[PDB]
Each structure stands twice: as C-alpha cells, then as structure tokens.
Amino acid sequence: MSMRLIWAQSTSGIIGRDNSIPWRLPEDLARFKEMTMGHPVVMGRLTWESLPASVRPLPGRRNIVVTRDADYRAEGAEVVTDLPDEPDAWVIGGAQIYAMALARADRCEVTEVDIALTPLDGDARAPVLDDSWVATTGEWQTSTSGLRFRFCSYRR
Numbered sequence: 001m002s003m004r005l006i007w008a009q010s011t012s013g014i015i016g017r018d019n020s021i022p023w024r025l026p027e028d029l030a031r032f033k034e035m036t037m038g039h040p041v042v043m044g045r046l047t048w049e050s051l052p053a054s055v056r057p058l059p060g061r062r063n064i065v066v067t068r069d070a071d072y073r074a075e076g077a078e079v080v081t082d083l084p085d086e087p088d089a090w091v092i093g094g095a096q097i098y099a100m101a102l103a104r105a106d107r108c109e110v111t112e113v114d115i116a117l118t119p120l121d122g123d124a125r126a127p128v129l130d131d132s133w134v135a136t137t138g139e140w141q142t143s144t145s146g147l148r149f150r151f152c153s154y155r156r
C-alpha cells in the first residue's frame with residue numbers, strides 16, 4: 001500500500017558500489033533522519049552491515065533486515081525472508097529491495113548528488129520512475145562539503 005522509498009544517487013543514477021558511498025553529504029544524513037525517525041526501516045543485509053556501528057540498529061526506528069538466509073543474526077533488528085507489509089515503513093537500501101518495493105510504493109524521496117562516477121561492474125542503480133509519479137524538484141543546493149546536490153520528492 002504505502003511503502004516509502006528513500007535513496008541518494010549520483011546524477012548518473014548510481015546509489016553506490018558494494019554499499020560504499022563516494023560522497024560526504026551531511027545534509028542528506030539530516031534529511032534521511034528527519035524522514036525515517038519513528039518509523040520502521042526496511043533494508044537488505046549489505047545495507048545493515050554497512051551502517052556505522054554507532055547507528056546499527058538505526059535508533060528510534062524499528063529495523064527490519066530482508067534476506068534469503070533465514071538464519072541470520074541482526075542484533076537489534078527483525079530478520080525476515082520477504083519484504084514485510086509494514087504500512088508506515090521506509091525502504092532504505094538494497095537496489096534489489098527498491099525494485100521489489102517500488103510496486104507497493106506511493107512516495108519516493110531522492111537526494112541527487114552532482115558527482116561524476118565511473119561506472120563499474122555490478123553498480124547499484126536507482127529505480128527509474130515512470131510517468132505515474134508526480135515530481136517535486138528542489139532547488140540546486142551547495143553542501144558544507146562543497147558538493148552540489150538537490151532533494152526531489154515523488155508522489156502518486
């Protein structure tokens with residue numbers, strides 16, 4: 001019904017390589033925290049293990065880890081084998097988790113980072129949103145880090 005997707009991507013659409021993020025953008029962390037606090041957050045195992053240890057699990061949010069390995073220990077998170085039907089939840093990671101949740105989604109919150117990245121094999125790419133989405137495009141912004149970025153919101 002009402003899954004929300006949130007991701008940060010380069011302008012070429014890359015959301016990371018092996019979960020590693022090439023940009024430092026504290027304004028994106030701030031907006032991620034504002035959007036997801038007090039709600040379940042749904043993620044893959046690689047996103048979970050890539051969280052900074054001090055916020056694994058992400059505090060103030062019910063953390064849910066989706067993986068085909070039924071036996072997996074995530075201290076502080078709920079381990080499920082399939083995407084859960086949590087109405088108010090935010091999907092936060094897994095290029096494949098975004099793909100699976102997109103059908104159930106009526107909101108996407110995107111940070112676009114103006115950073116050139118060389119494509120590498122097995123890159124995680126952002127979902128391409130079709131014409132059913134209504135886009136609200138924020139103004140281009142400059143970070144305390146010097147990077148240009150913008151926030152875009154999509155609804156249907």
Ligand SMILES: CCc1nc(N)nc(N)c1OCCCOc1cccc(CCC(=O)O)c1
Binds near residue numbers: 007028051111
């Ligand atoms: C924030 C990157 C991001 N940015 C966007 N826009 N979407 C995402 N899915 C997304 O990855 C979420 C997985 C990594 O999470 C972190 C990682 C480090 C610090 C924090 C803030 C802690 C807090 O929030 O308390 C969160």
